[PDB]
Amino acid sequence: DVSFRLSGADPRSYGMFIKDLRNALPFREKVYNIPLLLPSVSGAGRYLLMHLFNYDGKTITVAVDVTNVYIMGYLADTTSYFFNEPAAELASQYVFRDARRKITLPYSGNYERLQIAAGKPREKIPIGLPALDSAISTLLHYDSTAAAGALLVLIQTTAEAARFKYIEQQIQERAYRDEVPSLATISLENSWSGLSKQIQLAQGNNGIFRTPIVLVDNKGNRVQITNVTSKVVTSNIQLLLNTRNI
Ligand SMILES: *[C@@H]1O[C@H](CO)[C@@H](O)[C@H](O)[C@H]1NC(C)=O
Ligand SMILES: NC(=O)c1cccnc1
């Protein structure tokens, strides 16, 4: 398992937690020195548990699918909560079985459905460590509309930060003051599968993408990624979704 405490948290401790989250995910090979997530994992070993503590020391445990870094659900005291989708249904056969009751959230765990439930797009929701503290606290007591926004914060400050060093850095910059994500952050989140695929297809094509990927950079400009010498590939992306799952 991995753990992170908001009490005493700073950019250093958050960065270390994200390193630990990345390194908790199994892989058997690297592609251009980036861990390639496994095509499949059978049984309980498919799920990583992340123990998150809010500033007051109250805790939730979050179950993450190690093949894609997707959050399946979480445990708050004696109640488990799972997204309304087959992958989370499966997860609930393996994790948090000791919970006294299970609530299936009234949405699946993708951005489209979460944004509808929250009533707002990612672009308008501040993120940062204070927002993560708030998100943990919200998830402690069931409220599905509030939970949708909290889960948008949680996903971006854990899974997306693990996937992209740039997003990790954005959250570090928001350690003590929340701010909506940059355009670049949104573009990277929206392109993780596409980038993962092209980096894998570039092996066998001399590091050249079969199909270029368009992103927004940290200055807000459109850029086209065409090959693995791009900083997006050499320093930014940290985990690759297996093409078997694309
Ligand atoms: C490969 O990517 C690098 C880094 O972004 C870029 O400078 C170079 O022009 C690209 N090569 C092409 C497009 O042939
Ligand atoms: N459910 C998730 O953890 C999730 C959702 C959207 C993108 N990445 C991860």
CATH of the domain at 78: 3.40.420.10
Asked whether 246 and 197 are in contact (CB, 8 A), the reply is: yes
* Structure tokens belonging to residue 148: 């949708």
Q: Within this chain, do residues 232 and 114 fall inside the same structural domain, yes or no?
A: no
Say how many Å lie between the CA of residue 30 and the centre of ligand 2: 22
The label of the residue with tokens 């079969």 reads 210
Cα separations (Å) of 198 from 42, 88, 111, 160, 188?
A: 26, 27, 22, 18, 14
d(CA 225, CA 77): 45
DSSP for 60-99, written as a single string: EEEEEETTTTEEEEEEETTEEEE-SSHHHHHHTTTS-TT-
Out of 162, 191, 215, a domain closes at 162
- Resolution, rounded to a tenth of an Å? 1.4
**Enclosing domain of residue 200:** 163-246
The label of the residue with tokens 């000791």 reads 98
Cβ count near 234 (within 10 Å): 12
Ligand nearest to the backbone CA of 83: 2
Q: Determine the 3-state secondary structure of 15 from DSSP.
A: helix
DSSP for 132-165, written as a single string: HHHHHHHHTS--HHHHHHHHHHHHHHTHHHHHBH
- Given the DSSP bridges, would you call strands 47-53 and 34-37 parallel, antiparallel or unpaired? unpaired
Element (DSSP H or E) covering residue 212: strand 208-216
d(CA 211, CA 228): 12
Out of 134, 162, 190, a domain closes at 162
Q: Which residues contact residue 29 at a Cβ distance below 8 angstroms, ignoring those fewer than 6 apart?
A: 36
- Solved using: X-ray
Out of 115, 138, 162, a domain closes at 162
Q: Quick one: which atom of ligand 2 is closest to the CA of 111?
A: 6
Element (DSSP H or E) covering residue 122: none
The β-bridge partners of 65 are 47, 70
For ligand 1, say whether the CB of 230 is within 6 Å of any of its atoms.
Answer: yes
For ligand 2, say whether the CB of 87 is within 6 Å of any of its atoms.
Answer: no
Q: Within this chain, do residues 15 and 130 fall inside the same structural domain, yes or no?
A: yes
Q: Within this chain, do residues 34 and 137 fall inside the same structural domain, yes or no?
A: yes
For ligand 1, say whether the CB of 218 is within 6 Å of any of its atoms.
Answer: no
Active-site hit among 160, 168, 179, 189: 160
Ligand nearest to the backbone CA of 227: 1
Q: Classify residue 43 as left (phi > 0), alpha (psi -120 to 50) or beta.
A: left
- Rounded (to 5) percent helix, strand, coil in the chain: 40, 25, 35
Element (DSSP H or E) covering residue 191: none
Q: Within this chain, do residues 158 and 180 fall inside the same structural domain, yes or no?
A: no
d(CA 20, CA 132): 18
Q: Quick one: which atom of ligand 2 is closest to the CA of 109?
A: 1
For ligand 1, say whether the CB of 229 is within 6 Å of any of its atoms.
Answer: yes
Q: Within this chain, do residues 181 and 157 fall inside the same structural domain, yes or no?
A: no
Q: Within this chain, do residues 42 and 109 fall inside the same structural domain, yes or no?
A: yes
Say how many Å lie between the CA of residue 226 and the centre of ligand 1: 6
